[PDB]
Amino acid sequence: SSSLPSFQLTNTSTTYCTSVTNTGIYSCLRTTIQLKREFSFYLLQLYIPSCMLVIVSWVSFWFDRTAIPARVTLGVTTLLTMTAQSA
Amino acid sequence: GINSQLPPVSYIKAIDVWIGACMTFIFCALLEFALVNHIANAGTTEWNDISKRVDLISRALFPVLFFVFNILYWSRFGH
Ligand SMILES: CC[C@H](C)[C@H]1O[C@]2(CC[C@@H]1C)C[C@@H]1C[C@@H](C/C=C(\C)[C@@H](O[C@H]3C[C@H](OC)[C@@H](O[C@H]4C[C@H](OC)[C@@H](O)[C@H](C)O4)[C@H](C)O3)[C@@H](C)/C=C/C=C3\CO[C@@H]4[C@H](O)C(C)=C[C@@H](C(=O)O1)[C@]34O)O2
Ligand SMILES: *[C@@H]1O[C@H](CO)[C@@H](O)[C@H](O)[C@H]1NC(C)=O
Ligand SMILES: CCCCCCCCCCC
Ligand SMILES: CCCCCCCC
Ligand SMILES: [Cl-]
């Protein structure tokens, strides 16, 4: 688990997968590990920064309606950045 | 860029604390712009000079706070 940083090995199972083929019936075992993706990364590199990006788009609601350049610059920049991050 | 050369982990790295903080100082700068500009266009001169006051305070408070942060940060992770 220490050499597996990105996931968390939650459960394992030991089963049989014997199957019938055209050349005959072959005995078969199957071991199965269950990997749960770590969330800390995606919280910090995706969710948090996107909220922070969406929240920025709101601070333009507090700029006077006359200064529209400021509003557009915010709304547009956050939108572009949103795209980049997703890419 | 930095986070791209790293494996997704389950803990908060010291790098994260430093990026996140600088992120905030810039976010609050924007917030300040809005606050200042909003109370500025208010008809009364009562708010107008308050608007001026916020800038004066910010011009010093921000650097000071950022300096304080650096001190706390480096003492905590430079050890
Ligand atoms: C707080 C979100 C809002 C939107 C704020 O965002 C900003 C400013 C605007 C808003 C107020 C910007 C944001 C940082 C935050 C400030 C956050 C910190 C200074 C640190 O984190 C805080 C909160 C965190 O818990 C959310 C908490 O961890 C706890 C709780 C967790 O579980 C709930 C748990 O997992 C954990 C184990 O223990 C932590 C101790 O302390 C710091 C760690 C955050 C770093 C953030 C980032 C670093 O690189 C990321 C990315 O490369 C990028 C481009 C944007 C950054 C960002 O998004 O910057 C980024 O994602 O503020
Ligand atoms: C792990 O645990 C749960 C509960 O026992 C079970 O439903 C799941 O199928 C298991 N996964 C594996 C891969 O063994
Ligand atoms: C009374 C106001 C004095 C403001 C000084 C601001 C200095 C900022 C320096 C940032 C490096
Ligand atoms: C650790 C976050 C510090 C944010 C300070 C912001 C001051 C305007
Ligand atoms: Cl631009």
- The CATH number covering residue B46 comes to 1.20.58.390
Contact (Cβ atoms closer than 8 angstroms) between residue A10 and residue A33: no
Domain total in chain B: 1
How is residue B54 written in tokens?
């916020």
On chain A, the residues whose CB falls within 8 A of the CB of B29 are: none
Distance CA B34, CA B41 (A): 11
Which residue range is the domain that position B52 belongs to? 1-79
CA atoms of A20 and A16, how far apart (whole Å): 13
Q: Å resolution of this model? A: 3.4
**Mutation pick for ligand 3 pocket among B58, B59, B62, B70 (CB with most ligand atoms within 8 Å):** B59
Indicate the helix (H) or strand (E) that contains A73.
helix A68-86
Q: How far apart are CA B74 and CA B79, in angstroms?
A: 8
Residue ranges in B3-79 assigned as alpha helix (H): 14-40, 45-77
- Quick one: tokens of A86? 């997703």
Pick from A30, A10, A66, A29: nearest CA to B40: A66
For residue B79 the two structure tokens come to: 């050890």
* CB proximity list for A76: less than 8 A, separation 6 or greater: none
Going through A1-87 in order, the beta strands assigned E by DSSP cover: 7-16, 19-20, 25-26, 29-37
How many whole angstroms separate alpha carbon A41 and alpha carbon B54?
Answer: 37
